[PDB]
Amino acid sequence: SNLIEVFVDGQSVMVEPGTTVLQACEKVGMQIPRFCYHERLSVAGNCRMCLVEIEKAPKVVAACAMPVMKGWNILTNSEKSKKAREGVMEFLLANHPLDCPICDQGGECDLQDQSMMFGSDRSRFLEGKRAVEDKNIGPLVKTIMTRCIQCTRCIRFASEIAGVDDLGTTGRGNDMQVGTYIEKMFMSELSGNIIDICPVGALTSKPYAFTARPWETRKTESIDVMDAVG
Amino acid sequence: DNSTYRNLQHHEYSTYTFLDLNVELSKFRMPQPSSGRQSPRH
Amino acid sequence: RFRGEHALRRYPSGEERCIACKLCEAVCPAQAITIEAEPRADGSRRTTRYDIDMTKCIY
Amino acid sequence: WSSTADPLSNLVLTFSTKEDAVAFAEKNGWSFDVEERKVPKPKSKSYGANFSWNKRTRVSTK
Amino acid sequence: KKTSFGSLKDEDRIFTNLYGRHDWRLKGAQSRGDWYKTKEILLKGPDWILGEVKTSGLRGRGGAGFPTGLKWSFMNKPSDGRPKYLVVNADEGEPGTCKDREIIRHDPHKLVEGCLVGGRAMGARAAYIYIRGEFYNEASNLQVAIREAYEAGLIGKNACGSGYDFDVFVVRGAGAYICGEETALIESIEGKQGKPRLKPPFPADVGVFGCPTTVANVETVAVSPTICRRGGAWFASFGRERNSGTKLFNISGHVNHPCTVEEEMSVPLKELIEKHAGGVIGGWDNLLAVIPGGSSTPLIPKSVCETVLMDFDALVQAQTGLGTAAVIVMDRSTDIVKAIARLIEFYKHESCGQCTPCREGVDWMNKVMARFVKGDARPAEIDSLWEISKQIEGHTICALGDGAAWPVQGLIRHFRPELEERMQQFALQHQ
Amino acid sequence: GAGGALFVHRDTPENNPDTPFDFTPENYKRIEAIVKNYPEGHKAAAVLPVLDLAQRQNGWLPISAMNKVAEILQVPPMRVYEVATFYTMYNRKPVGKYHIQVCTTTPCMLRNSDSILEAIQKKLGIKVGETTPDKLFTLIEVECLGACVNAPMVQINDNYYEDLTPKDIEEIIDELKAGKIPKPGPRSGRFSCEPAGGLTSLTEPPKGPGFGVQAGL
Ligand SMILES: NC(=O)C1=CN([C@@H]2O[C@H](COP(=O)(O)OP(=O)(O)OC[C@H]3O[C@@H](n4cnc5c(N)ncnc54)[C@H](O)[C@@H]3O)[C@@H](O)[C@H]2O)C=CC1
Ligand SMILES: Cc1cc2nc3c(=O)[nH]c(=O)nc-3n(C[C@H](O)[C@H](O)[C@H](O)COP(=O)(O)O)c2cc1C
Ligand code: SF4
Ligand code: SF4
Ligand code: SF4
Ligand code: SF4
Ligand code: FES
Ligand code: FES
Ligand SMILES: [Mg+2]
């Protein structure tokens, strides 16, 4: 048929045209690190955590956005890709606040886990960090924007899934901030989901605040009855 | 001949000169292409 | 370095140091610590329950 | 404190396949409910679709 | 066959009204050879124009030096149903660069004719010229020239006795250096923030309004009608192989006569500086360093500038890159660390903030360089800064991160002893 | 170094959604032309020009101006907010009658731009980012303005004043204070960026049409 042959760590795999490097790695069972990529959202490509080396290619490519080409050998664990991951994690952690004990996303943080699995174990940042003022978007989503890593997942979800275009970015460079630019509540029947998509403790549940840690909780798989969707 | 500088009319441009020239140019333009809808939100 | 009876300390201003992160509860080899927390009246992250079973503690 | 009386409240077992877990449950005499594995279906991603000429996939911000 | 370059005859230049001493208007442009036999070039077909551009050896005048014929041929695919556009990059963001401003204010008609010729070559329906927002009078002059071209029938309906329809639009930016990047320029035209998009797709597939597009520099567009009229062989006669033609140079900084001048491509840097800029202030011995291709190119010291040529390959061999051919010279009386730190501060102030490496790392490098200027650091931090620059370079969405990493690398490579001396002085006087 | 300008809006008696703003009918005709410049599926492309036009009508951009532009183009207000806070030429706060922008980038800093900055500072009695008490001038430090050959230079209300000495900028300031407009361009009489005494190029008359046209054309 129309399937093309690519290689993940030298292992052959047949993929459809338009498949990205990230999905090609997924088909073999390797999960590429990510912060801005979501399956249900449009591709952003700004967090650069998915950078991976293509064999016989001098430049690393963004796996979440780059379509795979026939005969490409993706080197998921090569030295170049690991160094790229370490550099990106260092940049992400340079201005991040030391809020882990008081952050609700302590044991459930993709930033924490991906720093432990793909980043370095120390810092060489000898400067001062930046701090931004928090935003009020209603009584459901608690906002602490110093923890924001500017992945723009919340903006994409609000625009594409919820159909609400009130979220965005203001400023430029290091002081670019995610918010509304006016005092306004982000109130929609799907508003709480931005808590789930946010990889960090920038957006958290307000009624759930400070009540439990993830390792304590017992998970019961069940069904909603608040409507007839099930 | 050469010694004379001949770009002095930019000395007499106002605040609205650019948009006025655009308004004058509007009648010289070919009809615009259409994507089929009013906007991507339509 | 001697370890004796447990104590909860506070800052010089008089406010307690504990911010209910539950790291001590997580690491406790005997599960001797029980913690419950909620936002305070002024929004602070503080504990409402902090129990140590001294007969389960291994010090 | 939270008190319980059933000894199996914390018992969770790990298995490689559904068949292994079913065999373990049947040989141990436990009535079981099996739930089929949920796998996220593969999706069609296209970065260029963000800048569409006429489709609605065109994004207003990035 | 030629071995020496850098004595370009006056009659052999393209931008004959660079200094604005003639009439930039339609009559004045027609006097200097503009809009001559444009109908013939239009009727000779897009394939012929593309071939002439290919044989000309014309490379990217924006700073990257990509062969322009190859890109304009990338646009040569059959129609797909969407319109096709040409976008002329007139952002002029690079510090030290002033050539496009001069060729827009004093010779707009060459730019308009280049727009028409390139649009015919790529089959575009219209040309969007993204002028810098600060260049208001230049934009007004361009609009007046476009009005004159419309009145004379040189552009617009049928554009000639040629049968081709072509529109030229002028859109103004609003203070953004990143909007010079081609994809960020496309985003800015569409009414969004000037944040670049990822590649692929390339503009020839998905560009402005999602349509096939080519983004070209003002100089690249403006030299094209002259290339078509005089032939690609004439243009390739100048300069070395793969570095052919003539170039506009902006010499600024510590020179007696800072100026813009058009000269043959592979001219020696010293020869150009002495012949046109009046030499280095205080004499050639007074020279300390040169930034040859705008703020995004690494500096080189006197020993390299002694016998280096001014083109892509020779400057790449000198570990710099030709860039935009904007020469910024510094004598031995200036704090080179302060100048590099000022450039890094500019890059911190100009990054769009989309991708984390550029955003956070350039902020970090700015803070580190600010500390370096005073000597408040330790010698072990120089290598750490080098590693930070390497972590930025090659990991960002666009080349602004590379353009911020390269000056730091050049400063370290050529003046590490000065940084260490500053650190020792600060430690001595602070204890 | 630091920005110093906020990117969050808090309502003010002089800057709130009910602040009166509207477009003049001539500006409405200009808006019609600007919109007509674009294909009839993508009208958001006119956000940057029209916003600019609003500033040209008001001197600055109140939140009501952004709301009106968003309403006119039928784009969400947040996109207009993003555009207004991204581009530095937009004044989201009131600015003086004469906005003075001094370039301090390295090519201009090399040719003594600090002397010009301090001369303006002394003449106006204001600091780098302040405005005069009579609301006549605003001083602002900007990046490279594309006139590096004519450094040092400043930009005042769309006009480039180049090759400045401190005396030159003082004469410009007090001529603006007098009431009439100083003539733009470089000082020192070099006529737009050729060598000051060199004249090493474009010396003989330029060649006309057909000078070097190839055969068969
Ligand atoms: N003129 C000015 O004011 C400024 C110039 N620059 C210069 O711009 C340079 C970097 O610009 P970039 O666009 O990032 O370099 P680039 O090499 O990635 O792109 C150059 C041109 O070639 C095209 N191109 C390159 N590879 C292609 C491919 N495989 N397929 C199709 N098209 C391809 C690109 O679409 C682009 O139009 C820098 O060296 C800098 O000196 C930088 C800032 C300002
Ligand atoms: C950050 C950045 C800013 C740029 N600014 C400009 C600019 O202002 N003018 C320009 O012509 N090119 C600029 N470029 C280079 C453009 O990408 C270039 O114009 C484009 O690739 C095609 O130009 P060409 O016709 O010379 O090949 C910039 C590139 C980057 C990375
Ligand atoms: S978001 Fe993650 S890394 Fe940041 S403070 Fe919270 S738990 Fe720690
Ligand atoms: S608030 Fe969360 S989801 Fe939104 S951009 Fe910041 S990190 Fe991403
Ligand atoms: S919960 Fe335990 S570890 Fe955390 S602050 Fe309180 S006492 Fe310390
Ligand atoms: S490198 Fe800088 S300017 Fe370029 S996309 Fe990334 S953040 Fe924006
Ligand atoms: S996951 Fe690909 S750049 Fe963020
Ligand atoms: S450095 Fe000042 S105009 Fe360019
Ligand atoms: Mg979250």
Task: Name the descriptors.
part of a larger assembly, 6 chains, C: about 60 residues, mainly beta, two-stranded antiparallel ribbon, D: about 60 residues, mainly alpha, about 0% strand, elongated, binds 1,4-dihydronicotinamide adenine dinucleotide, binds FE2/S2 (inorganic) cluster, 2Fe-2S (chain F), EC 7.1.1.2 (chain F)
Task: Tell me about this structure.
This is part of a larger assembly, with chains A (230 residues), B (42 residues), C (59 residues), D (62 residues), E (431 residues) and F (217 residues). Chain C has 59 residues and is mainly beta. By secondary structure, chain D is an all-alpha fold. Helix content of chain D is 16%, strand content 0%. Chain D has one helix and no strands. Chain E is of the alpha/beta class and 431 residues long. Among the domains of chain E are: 86 residues, Ubiquitin-like (UB roll) (Roll), CATH 3.10.20; 95 residues, Up-down Bundle (de novo design (two linked rop proteins)), CATH 1.20.1440.230. In chain E, helix 14 runs antiparallel to helix 15 and helix 15 packs parallel to helix 17. Chain E starts with 25 loop residues before the first helix and ends with a helix. Chain F is an alpha/beta fold. Among the domains of chain F are: 62 residues, NADH-quinone oxidoreductase subunit E (Arc Repressor Mutant, subunit A, Orthogonal Bundle); 89 residues, Glutaredoxin. Helices cover 35% and strands 10% of the residues of chain F. Chain F has a five-stranded mixed sheet with strand order 2-1-3-4-5, with helices on one face. Chains in contact: A-C, A-D, A-E, A-F, B-D, B-E, B-F, D-E, D-F, E-F. Chains D and E meet through loops of D and loops of E. The structure holds 1,4-dihydronicotinamide adenine dinucleotide, flavin mononucleotide (FMN), iron/sulfur cluster (4 copies), FE2/S2 (inorganic) cluster (2 copies) and magnesium ion. The site of one iron/sulfur cluster has 12 residues of chain A, from helix 3.
